[PDB]
Amino acid sequence: RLGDIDFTGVSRTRGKFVRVTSSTDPAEIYQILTKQWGLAPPHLVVALMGGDEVAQLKPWLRDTLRKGLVKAAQSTGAWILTSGLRFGITKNLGQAVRDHSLASTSPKVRVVAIGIAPWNMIQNRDLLLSAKPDHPATYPTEDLPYGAVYSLDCNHSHFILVDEDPKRPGATGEMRVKMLKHISLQRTGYGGTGSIEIPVLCLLVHGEPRILQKMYKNIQNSIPWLILAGSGGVADILVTLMDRGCWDADIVQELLINTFPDGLHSTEITSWTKLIQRILDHGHLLTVHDPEQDSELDTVILKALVKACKSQSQEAQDFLDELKLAVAWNRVDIAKSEIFSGDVQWSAQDLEEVMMEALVNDKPDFVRLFVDNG
């Protein structure tokens, strides 16, 4: 089910898509993304897990988040996994991605916004149902209100239209989780010689209690999460719990009730409390991003990844991917503070490849650091 979309409206753009069922293997979709659509394996994957709630971010925080994400992503080739629906934070994030793409004087590195959207949420699905390979389907762009049905965003280059599973109404979440897990087990390069394991990272923006199960499943899959300090939903609960230092069942219940007065179900409240406790039990996979304080998303992403790697193991070869990513972002301070601090032994054979990468990509600070480190 491959087709092309020719969005018609203020800006005429061409976008690809593929229909898929929730029972498919994510390996096939990854292969079709890499080969059929010509997308190079990303050097960074940032998945959005929010912004579909009625309450939306303030324009200042929305702009700060989009600028930080685009600035972090533009160094390398990154993918931004969002629900390809023209609404909320997703619409503006796709707008920022397309604005960067148009203004990008270097097409070698490309920031691609992939859209994983449910088939039940698509407006005018019959219009794209034609999907003639010779003649791309014409799709009209309409800025619908919240409601329950949205239109495909024109700014998203590629789409993954998942069909709703008759078993449970969570097919899109399961597909997103499986896709993130599968992508996290790939190599960022064409060959496994100078390639890193793809850094998959999730971002939470004003989540609802319904997505707690998917978030915990992702955490079980061992992929880091970033929490906006001023998002508003479950993100506020998590940042308040982090500020507390410790989590208690009564405390988390009280915060959940205060933040979500509408939801009052004893079984649901208990399940959400248990899910939140189990999520906070990990901790090392959770990291808070405060745009009012830090406003440097790349630094926080690198810190979260290096924290996860350090929690995983102490071997030098394990830290290699994080060090290479730090090289690619000129974060010599972060690398010196985290990776090259006492605990990890560093041999010349271990550092030869990273030395090559820093030397080719014109990173003098990392060259100095590696020469000074063996």
Binding site: S11, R12, K67, D99, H100, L102, A103
Partner: protein
């Protein structure tokens, strides 16, 4: 007067050079007294029927507008960052 005027005179020369080049754009390539041939040809063409100031396709125009907006945002961000790191602001 030379010492005080020369620097402004250079800028004024550049500003006038723009207009002179604009004039030379539409000037016929034949110098006088030959220029009469070009004038007759132009009159005949008008009776029978630019590298600067060009009009671009919609896609390219939108791309350049977005690129201008991105560059403006970068320039403003640089100004604000330089303001934050200034000695007075730090004090």
């Amino acid at each position: 007067t030379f010492q005080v005027v020369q620097e402004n005179a250079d800028i004024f020369w550049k500003f006038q050079r723009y207009n002179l080049i604009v004039e030379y754009h539409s000037r016929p390539a034949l110098a006088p007294p030959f220029i009469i041939i070009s004038h007759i040809t132009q009159a005949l063409l008008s009776f029978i029927k630019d590298l600067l100031e060009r009009e671009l396709p919609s896609g390219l125009d939108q791309k350049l507008m977005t690129w201008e907006t991105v560059q403006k945002e970068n320039y403003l961000a640089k100004l604000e960052h330089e303001h934050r790191e200034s000695s007075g602001e730090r004090l």
